[PDB]
Structure 1
Amino acid sequence: SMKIDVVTIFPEYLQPVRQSLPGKVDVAVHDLRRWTHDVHKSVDDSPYGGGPGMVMKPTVWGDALDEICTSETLLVVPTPAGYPFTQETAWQWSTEDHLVIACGRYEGIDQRVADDAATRMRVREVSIGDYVLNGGEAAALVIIEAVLRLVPGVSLLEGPSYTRPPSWRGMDVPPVLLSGDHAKIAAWRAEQSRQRTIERRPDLLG
């Protein structure tokens, strides 16, 4: 039983995830502008100390999180400056009762928001990879998917996979896979995994 609240200025970005859950979990999306104070519905402002872009306003985010979060909440803040989000993270968060995901522009949410929230609840600032996105929405989709697929209801790299037909455009499925020698098949797959990992992800081997 997990509740996920997502807060974003692009709520429609998150709706496909909502219309993706089978038969249960609860995922709610909130337009950040609901907590703005002015008729212009301002969510960001110029950065102190100068610089390009805008920083999201602490008064707006503070009100939103005050309403949505509780002491039991794990507040997830996607940011390119975060700790890395990994499969281990996904496993850890899969047993949480309440995730709140705060989606901001990459220039950031005023740091006092996360710092204030951390005095009352658990806060996790995380990156999903080494690339820059305009905002946290796509990263939220990745996190929601990686976490929810580990909830009951819903090393080395894996090598190549094959299915019918056995011959296709002049390429045959490796005959070992058809051999009925399942110990040999396992060893072949292990070697394919070794070769692929060396080639594509040597970092996984040290």
Structure 2
Amino acid sequence: SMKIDVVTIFPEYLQPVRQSLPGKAIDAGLVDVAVHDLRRWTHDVHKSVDDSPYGGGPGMVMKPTVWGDALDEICTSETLLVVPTPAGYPFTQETAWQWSTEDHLVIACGRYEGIDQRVADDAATRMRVREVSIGDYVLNGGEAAALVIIEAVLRLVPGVSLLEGPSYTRPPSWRGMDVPPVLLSGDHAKIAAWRAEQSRQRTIERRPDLLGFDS
């Protein structure tokens, strides 16, 4: 079993849904996903979680005090604390495999301007902390990135390179477009060869970096 806690000011957005990969995982008892409203650890009447940045700049920064209290209650020294951010280390397939063996993930969802950096630094003194980016784009907060991380990790939990080329299924002809004959041929070796070629051809066109080329 794995435990995933998600902490956010948008709990409804993160609520697990039965008809999904994580929903199935939960229903199969392979993971328990709990979502927590950050505002649960506020004290003021207006339940404030952010404040203007020191030193100036646009937007707001999430308060360290509120987060400090939330992670105190939720994390232990065994927790892997995940903090999605466009400024993070890259989250990759290797990361997903690694996190798929973790007992307890806690995902701190905050606006992209940041949680006050002292939260992560403080946490780092008692648990492992991973600030990570799921890609080279900006989201308003870590919520959608949390959903992506959960999806990528859970499909790897026991009991649940190059680009893959095109795939086909029935019928063999459709709207005047035919399935590549080799795929119909039953010749496993020629098919493996064809798919390896297609894969390399797609990779060089769409992701030349993966093959050690420019752009």
- Aligned partners of 2:69, 2:106: CA distance in 1, in Å? 14
* Cα 1:73–1:18 shift into 2, 3 Å: farther
| 1:54-76 residue CA offsets vs partner (Å, 9 max, x unmatched) | 00000000000000000110000
Contact 2:22–2:154 (Cα < 8 Å) also in 1 = no
- Aligned partners of 2:97, 2:146: CA distance in 1, in Å? 16
Contact 2:16–2:33 (Cα < 8 Å) also in 1 = no
* Cα 1:85–1:195 shift into 2, 3 Å: same
- Aligned partners of 2:189, 2:203: CA distance in 1, in Å? 21
Q: Give 1:153 shift.
A: 2.6
What's the Cα RMSD here?
1.4
Contact 1:74–1:100 (Cα < 8 Å) also in 2 = yes
* Cα 1:48–1:5 shift into 2, 3 Å: same
* Cα 1:110–1:98 shift into 2, 3 Å: same
> Unaligned stretches of 5+ in structure 2?
25-30
1:144 pairs with 133, 142, 150, which one?
150
Secondary structure at the residue paired with 1:3? strand
- Aligned partners of 1:40, 1:155: CA distance in 2, in Å? 49
> Unaligned stretches of 5+ in structure 1?
none
Contact 1:79–1:127 (Cα < 8 Å) also in 2 = yes
* Cα 1:162–1:19 shift into 2, 3 Å: closer
| 1:66-87 residue CA offsets vs partner (Å, 9 max, x unmatched) | 0000011000000000000000
Contact 2:8–2:110 (Cα < 8 Å) also in 1 = yes
Q: Does 1:104 align with 2:110?
A: yes
The percentage of aligned residue pairs carrying the same residue is 100
Q: Give 1:152 shift.
A: 1.4
Q: Give 1:118 shift.
A: 0.2
* Cα 1:148–1:46 shift into 2, 3 Å: same
Q: Which runs of 4+ in 1 moved over 4 A?
A: 21-24
- Aligned partners of 2:145, 2:22: CA distance in 1, in Å? 22
* Cα 1:23–1:41 shift into 2, 3 Å: closer
Contact 1:95–1:151 (Cα < 8 Å) also in 2 = yes
Secondary structure at the residue paired with 1:105? coil
